[PDB]
Each structure stands twice: as structure tokens, then as C-alpha cells.
Scaffold this active site. Structure first.
Site: not given
Lengths: 82, 128, 158, 252, 31, 56, 57, 252
Positions: C9, C49, C57, C85, C91, C105, C115, C118
């Protein structure tokens, strides 16, 4: 024809959002490669022929000089015993 | 260490169309339909198969280094005077003795000391 | 073999840490099938998304996921979905920083939305993400080659 | 096997041949070449040469390209040229029309060193004004199509029919013979080397102990090429006013 | 309508080739 | 069950410059996996399924 | 060297090229401790240079 | 991919790190290295380093070898060392016994610069006299077994189980990380890199725009290594008195 069947195969495999349009695009690329293949074959055969002909001439060019030097030696040595 | 190889083979190629795995899949899928009763050459059949935001660093440090060369651009106040030593001669002496930083860096250092000594906003008497 | 969809990100990209993240991804036995550095638009970031159109949010996120360039990656490993993961960790950046101090993260995240990563969560979602970003990579023609569903897909195509 | 000529090795090996650059220009190049190579999107960019001028501001010329492809039996490199007069800021060296190519070919003498100057020619009395950068670009084009030397079989053709470095190249078997070198625009495997050029337009000096061959052009005196065989490097450079040697038959 | 099952056979052949290549790389590792 | 048939077919047909196309591909893949080359897809035709002209 | 005979005029310009030209050690006139000299145009290859009381040809 | 480090590029890239040689010595090396390499029958011979002395006659040390082979999990290079004090005439630097290795390890300070000198040690009072060239060889051996840096996967094993250059090497993916480099004596594919060394004994500075990484040893301050990634070259050099830095824990 085979084009339609393989295009449907691709449309099921790659699973596009627009099947018909991607189908047409693949059809056009295929019909281009249909000629590209023969062009590739032509190119390869012609290049191999060029190679072989160059080598043939390289061989004959040395055969000539072999024969000429041989004839010279022939006469030169023949004179010795007369 | 077999799934390692199978994963490596599927690394997609940005230049070429697909991965090596897919290339072999298409080659074999053709041969199974081709069925060369006599023989076939691998090189030629693979060739027949194949024939059918930028990521650049930032130039800030490098451009700052290159800007000490030549003369600045004008869209000019008089450059102030300053005293110094013969710096190119210093690079030469050090290089002859085998110490220092060389002679390309000697040139860069001399031009940097020039850009320092000839600065209005920094009234310098001498640079070393 | 399992393929998962990852993401670096814009906060990690701006900090100059995408190369470190990829090098750690590959130090942990993964294999980057594909990498790309793109800039996501507004409508496409929405549709990505798209299952959170009613979430509160959602604008706070979508305005962040366009704040710069991102790195889209396709990872692969035996049991890749859950290992990725386990690498990204929790998260909540602070929760992660409390539990796994050496997590991903917990090293490159700052906020509950910053974070820096994803991953996918389910194989269905992973396949959908990958088909969304890399529509060229063919995914399991074996499974989709149902002798009956093919006639239905022909009806769809006609 | 190198992937691209190194300007440091070029300037080191061809310094005996008088192909040198100023010290300031050497440093300035070391900084400026990467900047221009990146901001032009090019895969390769090197120093091509240096043309002397009448006012002391010699033109440095750099040549770059992205990929070379086989077209019509020739290995075509889509090259792009840049010029400079200090080694720090590179400007474009734009191509010239075919009609103007003849006129600039008629202009001789050492260049002026003023990129804004233009020479005059007279024809049937129609006068043409030819910009100096046009003359420069054509001299560079002539020298490039004449020499452009690489070793033989150092390149190779790939699946997409593009000319790429042959990374398994082992070296020239006989480095002191002109058969070991070729023009860049000759396809791999075509058998055309420098020995097919006009006999007497190339000279080769080979130091068999250190393994460094120097190939000098006699048709364009000022073009030097070097090939180091123990390290497998090579590279060329032009230094001079850019005029062809037409009296060659009387000088050999 | 005869195109459907022809495409089905094509896709089955593709799956066949995929499995063939799977076995091939499996053997290459041992080699 | 066609897998075994295809395998027998491939281990049957002989290479132009060898034999058992299956085994040729197997040696190619083993060579590529031995040293994963720079641009492996391109190196398939320029280093493993062929030999450059001045290699040795 | 100001008085040496110039070269004959070449096609493209009427002015005879001079017999000598300048060579500079820097791209900016402001640089300190520059060296300079002249190079011949009649005999391309010959140069003379001088820094202080130290000169060479 | 280079086949052997080039002394010109080494001296050019590592000059900022103060690793320089005199001008006369540079020319003398350019002549002397090929002579000695040929008359010793060696395939490779390079400048290893330069050790400073108290009388101003620094020792230049050169290292050469013929072939490297894999033995007992280590890539063993049968190296041979030569020394010089002018750069023109190379003499042998003969190996030292194991018993004397400890004694010369106990001798500290800057070397004298007189190859005929010998130092003295005292033990239980038996006095030993250790020649200066023994001390020099021992210091070179220590520095060599400590650093000997090459890039990772730049070498490869061949059919005869010998370590040869990997001519298809593409470069280090992450040049600013210690994982990209390794010791010379680590077998290819063994996964042992410089990151397995004692943490904190190496420093890496990477200029990501030009693509030049510099790896400095902090345990033996004076050992510098460079790696240029756009041209795929690399090389190292030692310059200094040869003593190890034992206070490293207090200096980090």
C-alpha cells in the site's frame, strides 16, 4: 470450422467478461499466424539454402587450387627424369 | 523441492506472452495434435510456438553533483571574491604521492569549493 | 499449488520499503509469480472493495488507496493463502505490534488503515482479486472444464 | 562477456591512439550519461565521439538505443544521438532529410563550434542555408555507417527475431585478423566481416602478449576500436573533425 | 451445435497436456 | 487415462537430433532448473535447445 | 602565431580557417587555476600549453 | 558478466574510499602484472592490496591462481601470492608454517619496510626470530580468510566439479543487502552469504541511481569491495597496515 471450435475453447478457458469480442480478437491473431507459419518455413529453408551454397562455393574454390598446384608439381617432377 | 520448481516455472514473463510452464503446455498440446510420425525438432517447433508506472530512481543527488559543472542558468549578482589554494595542484600532488581521493574526486572537490566560495548569501573569505 | 493475491500500500511505497517487503516475502519461501506497480483510480478502487459500499470507513480507505502508487503481487507456495496472512499478521497495527513484534504490519504499518499490506482471505476472493488485476494469467482451466457447464457457458456466449 | 562498452576502459585502451577527453569532461560524462540515459528511456547510451571545432568548444556526441531488430537482412538499431559542448547537458541531434544530406555532404572544413551558425551553398543562383547541427549529424551518420565495429558472433538472434548479446561468446579465435570483427548492422551468421570491406581501409595491431587488438580506420582516420581478449571487452571511439580521407589510394 | 462437444474435446486435451507437463516437471526434479 | 497414452506417445517419437521427445524436454527442464537462467523463456532457444556459434 | 598564414577556404564558408585554435581546460571562465594552450590546424596533432611559468609543446 | 576484476575499474571506484596507488606504481603495474602472470603460468593474477610501512616503501601484494575446485564443502582456490616494493619486479611470498603462524600473529605494529628485518619473540627464555615476510604473509592470510568477497551466485560448479564463472549471471536482485554477497570459499548453492557473518562487521552503501554498491569491512578496516550493477562488474582491494580491529564492540 476449427477456428470457431478453438475460439470457443479459449472463451471457456480464459473466461473473458466479453466473450464475443475477445473471440474475434483471437480469431484475427490466429488468421495472421496462419500465414506467419508458412513465412517462417520459407525463411528457414531459404537461409539453409544460402548457407549450403556458400559452402559449396568455398569447397570448389579450394578444389581448383588443389588441382592447379598438383599440375605444377606434375610438370616439375616430370622434367626431372627426361 | 518439487513445488518449488513448479512455482518457478510459472513465473509470468512481462516481455514474452506467458510463463515457461504455459509455453511447454502449448508446445505439448500442439505435438499431441501434430503427432510427428517420423520425427520433429525441438528448436523449430518451439520457435513455431513462440511465433504464434516506470520504476526509476530519483536523480536529486546525482543532479546536485552535476550542477557544479559549467555555469548556472539565468532566468546576476556579482560573485564574491575569495582566496584558496591551488586545488587541482593539490590533487596532482596527492596522486603522485599515492594518498588522498584520486583525481576525479579532486576535480569534483575543486568545483564544490568554487560553488561554496563564490556565494553571495555566504560571504566567505577563504575556503579549504 | 496455491496462489494468493498480495498488496503493498502507498504508505510502504512512499517510505522506500517495497523492495525490503518483496525481499522478505521471498526470504519466507514465497515465489512472486508476478509483480506490478500501478496507480489505482477512484472507480476501480471502488469496484475492488465493491463489497463494502455501505461501510462507514469506506471513503476513508478509498481516499488512502489512491494516495499514491501501489505494488500488486501474485504469490505462490504450498499452503500460500494462510501463510501469507500469518506473515502480514493482525490487521490492527498496534495489536500486531503488541503480539508479534517481528511481524510485517508490526514493522511497516502505522494506522488501522495504514497497515502497508492487503492479502486475500479465501481462495474464492483470491481468485477474484487475481482475475481483477491480472486478467491474463489463466487460472485452473481444469476445474472450469465441466462437460455440462460448458454448454451453459455457450448459451451465455451466444 | 560485456553487456555494454565501458567508457573508462575505452578511454584507457584508446589513449595511446590519441583518443582522449579533457579531465573536466571525463568527470562530467561520468555524471551526465546515466541521467540522460534514464530520462530518455534508453537501454544503452555511450560516448560515440568528439569532433574538434575552430573555437575550442568541441562537440561531444553520444549514441543510444533501446533494441535492435533484424529487418530486410540488416540488424537495424533504432539509434538516437545527442550532442554536448561541456559534457554536462545533452541536447538532441535531430535527423536530417535526404535532400539536405547531399548539401551537408558538400560542406567541408573543420566545424565552427557555434551551433547557431549556418553555412551557405549555391546551385542553379539558388542559395541554401544549412545549419551547422545538420552538418554535424550527417558527418556522424557517414562515420557510423562506415565503421560501427563489433566482434564477430558477439551478437545473436533471439526468438522474437531481435539482436541481443551472445552471452556464451567465447572470444575471437584469431584477434589479429580482420575476420574476427564485423559491422554492427550485419546479421549474425551472415558471414560478412570486415574482410569484405575495401582491402586496405582497415589496420590491425595486435599485442599478442597482453591480448589487446587495435583496429584503426584508414578511410575515416580518427575511428579507433579496441578488443581485449583476456577480459573479453571491446569498444570504439571517434575523435577528429569528421571528414573522410579521399586520398587513400595515394597514401597506401 | 456440433461445435460444443468439439470444444469440449479440445478443453479435455488441454487438461491432458497440463497433466502431462505436471508429470514432466515432476520427473525433471528427480533427474 | 489418456495421460499414459500421451506419455507412451512422447517417449515413443524420436527427436530430429536425438530420440524420445519426452526425454529431450526432460533434459531441457533439468538444465533450466539446474541454473535458472536470465530470461529463461528467451534462454530456451539461445542456450539449451541450441548452441550459440562461438560458445567454446 | 597571430601572423601565420591561414588555411585556404573550404566549401561552405568564405573565411579562411585560422592556422591555430584555442583549447580550454574548463567549461566556465570563472574556474580557478585553469590551464590553456593552442592547437595547430595545419598540422592536426601538434599542441602547445602553458599554466604558469611552465609550458610545453 | 566480467571474467576477472579489472584494476582500472577497481582503482576508479574505490578511490573515494581512499584506496589509491601512486601514479608511477599504477603504470608499473599496468606493465608488470601480465609479465608475471604469463611467466608463472597462472590463469588469473590481480592486485590484492597495499600494506603501509614505516620507511615509505609500501608492500604491494598480488594474488593469482589457476583453477578453483570444490573440496570438503569449500571452494578451494590454490592461490599464490607475490609482493613488490616498486610495482615492477614481483617476488614470491612463500607460505608459513602453522607453528610460526601463531608467533607472527602475536607481532603488531606497522611493518618496517625492510624485507631483511626479523622481529623477536620470547617464550618459556627461548627467543624466536620471525622474518618480516612471514609477518606479511600471515597478515595477508588473515585478511584473505576474513573477507574474499564476491557476489552471490556469480560462480557455479561444472561437470568436473570445479568452480567457474557463471556466465549467465544476471546480477544481484537487492544490491544494498548483505545477502547479495558471499565469501569466495563458499560453495555455489550453499546459501551461506555475508549475512551469516558476525552482525555488524560489514557496512554497505548503495547509490541506487548509479547502481554502485560499496561494502566495507569494519573488522579489518581497509578492505573495500565494489559492485557496479549496470555494468555487472565488481572487485576488492585492501589498503592499510594489516592489523585487525579488536575494539569493534566498543566502536559500533
Amino acid at each position: 470450422g476449427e477456428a470457431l471450435a478453438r475460439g470457443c475453447a479459449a472463451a471457456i478457458s480464459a473466461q473473458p467478461n466479453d466473450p464475443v469480442e475477445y473471440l474475434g480478437l483471437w480469431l484475427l491473431k490466429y488468421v495472421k499466424n496462419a500465414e506467419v507459419e508458412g513465412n517462417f518455413y520459407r525463411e528457414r529453408q531459404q537461409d539453409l539454402q544460402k548457407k549450403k551454397d556458400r559452402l559449396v562455393k568455398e569447397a570448389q574454390s579450394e578444389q581448383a587450387a588443389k588441382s592447379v598446384a598438383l599440375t605444377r608439381k606434375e610438370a616439375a617432377d616430370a622434367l626431372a627424369l627426361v | 523441492s518439487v513445488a518449488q520448481a513448479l512455482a518457478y516455472l510459472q513465473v509470468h514473463s512481462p516481455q514474452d506472452g506467458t510463463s515457461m510452464y504455459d509455453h511447454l503446455v502449448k508446445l505439448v498440446s500442439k505435438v499431441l495434435e501434430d503427432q510427428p510420425k517420423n520425427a520433429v525438432d525441438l528448436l523449430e517447433t518451439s520457435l513455431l510456438v513462440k511465433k504464434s508506472i516506470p520504476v526509476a530512481p530519483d536523480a536529486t543527488q546525482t543532479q546536485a553533483a552535476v550542477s557544479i559543472f559549467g555555469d548556472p542558468e539565468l532566468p546576476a549578482d556579482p560573485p564574491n571574491e575569495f582566496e584558496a589554494e591551488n586545488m587541482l595542484g593539490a590533487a596532482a600532488v596527492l596522486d603522485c604521492l599515492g594518498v588522498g581521493l584520486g583525481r576525479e574526486l579532486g576535480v569534483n572537490i575543486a568545483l564544490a569549493a568554487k560553488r561554496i566560495g563564490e556565494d553571495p548569501k555566504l560571504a566567505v573569505r577563504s575556503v579549504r | 499449488l496455491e496462489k494468493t493475491f498480495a498488496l503493498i500500500k502507498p504508505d510502504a511505497v512512499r517510505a522506500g520499503k517495497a523492495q525490503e517487503i518483496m525481499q522478505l516475502i521471498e526470504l519466507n519461501g514465497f515465489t512472486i509469480i508476478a509483480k506490478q506497480k500501478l496507480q489505482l483510480t477512484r472507480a476501480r478502487a471502488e469496484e475492488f472493495y465493491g463489497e463494502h459500499k455501505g461501510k462507514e470507513f469506506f471513503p476513508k480507505l478509498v481516499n488512502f488507496m489512491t494516495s499514491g502508487p501501489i505494488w500488486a503481487l501474485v504469490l505462490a507456495k504450498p499452503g500460500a493463502i494462510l501463510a501469507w496472512r500469518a506473515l502480514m499478521g493482525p490487521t490492527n497495527v498496534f495489536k500486531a505490534r503488541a503480539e508479534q513484534p517481528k511481524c510485517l504490519r508490526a514493522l511497516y504499518g502505522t494506522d488501522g488503515t495504514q497497515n502497508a499490506t492487503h492479502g486475500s482471505d479465501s481462495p474464492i476472493s483470491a481468485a477474484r482479486e487475481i482475475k481483477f488485476f491480472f486478467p491474463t494469467l489463466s487460472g485452473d482451466p481444469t476445474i472450469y472444464a465441466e462437460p455440462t457447464a460448458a454448454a451453459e457457458y455457450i448459451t451465455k456466449r451466444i | 562477456v560485456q553487456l555494454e562498452p565501458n567508457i573508462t576502459l575505452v578511454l584507457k585502451h584508446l589513449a595511446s591512439c590519441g583518443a582522449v577527453v579533457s579531465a573536466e569532461q571525463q568527470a562530467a560524462l561520468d555524471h551526465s550519461i546515466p541521467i540522460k540515459r534514464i530520462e530518455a528511456g534508453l537501454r544503452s547510451l555511450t560516448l560515440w565521439g568528439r569532433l574538434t571545432t575552430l573555437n575550442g568548444k568541441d562537440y561531444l556526441v553520444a549514441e543510444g538505443y533501446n533494441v535492435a531488430s533484424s529487418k530486410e537482412g540488416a540488424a537495424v538499431y533504432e539509434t538516437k544521438y545527442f550532442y554536448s559542448q561541456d559534457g554536462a547537458r545533452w541536447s538532441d541531434l535531430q535527423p536530417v532529410d535526404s535532400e539536405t544530406a547531399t548539401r551537408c555532404a558538400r560542406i567541408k572544413g573543420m566545424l565552427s563550434g557555434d551551433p547557431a551558425k549556418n553555412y551557405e551553398l549555391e546551385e542553379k543562383p539558388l542559395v541554401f542555408q544549412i545549419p551547422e547541427l545538420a552538418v554535424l549529424r550527417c558527418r556522424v551518420d557517414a562515420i557510423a555507417t562506415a565503421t560501427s565495429v563489433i566482434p564477430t558472433d558477439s551478437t545473436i538472434l533471439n526468438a522474437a527475431s531481435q539482436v541481443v548479446p551472445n552471452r556464451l561468446f567465447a572470444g575471437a579465435a584469431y584477434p589479429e585478423k580482420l575476420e574476427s570483427y564485423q559491422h554492427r548492422f550485419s546479421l549474425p551468421g551472415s558471414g560478412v566481416t570486415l574482410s569484405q570491406d575495401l582491402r586496405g581501409t582497415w589496420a590491425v595491431q595486435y599485442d599478442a602478449f597482453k591480448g589487446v587488438a587495435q583496429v584503426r580506420s584508414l578511410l575515416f582516420p580518427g575511428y579507433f576500436f579496441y578488443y581485449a581478449a583476456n577480459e573479453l571487452t571491446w569498444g570504439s571511439l571517434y575523435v577528429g573533425d569528421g571528414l573522410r580521407n579521399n586520398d587513400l589510394i595515394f597514401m597506401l | 451445435p456440433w461445435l460444443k462437444e468439439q470444444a469440449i474435446g479440445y478443453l479435455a486435451r488441454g487438461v491432458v497436456a497440463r497433466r502431462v507437463v505436471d508429470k514432466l516437471v515432476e520427473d525433471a526434479a528427480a533427474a | 487415462a489418456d495421460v499414459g497414452q500421451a506419455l507412451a506417445f512422447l517417449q515413443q517419437v524420436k527427436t530430429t537430433q536425438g530420440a524420445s521427445i519426452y526425454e529431450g524436454l526432460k533434459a531441457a527442464l533439468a538444465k533450466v532448473l539446474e541454473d535458472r537462467p536470465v530470461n529463461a523463456v528467451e534462454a530456451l532457444e539461445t542456450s539449451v535447445l541450441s548452441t550459440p556459434p562461438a560458445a567454446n | 602565431l597571430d601572423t601565420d598564414a591561414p588555411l585556404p577556404a573550404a566549401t561552405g564558408d568564405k573565411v579562411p580557417p585560422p592556422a591555430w585554435s584555442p583549447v580550454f581546460a574548463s567549461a566556465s571562465v570563472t574556474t580557478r587555476n585553469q590551464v590553456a594552450g593552442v592547437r595547430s590546424n595545419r598540422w592536426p596533432g601538434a599542441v602547445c600549453a602553458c599554466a604558469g611559468r611552465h609550458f610545453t609543446s
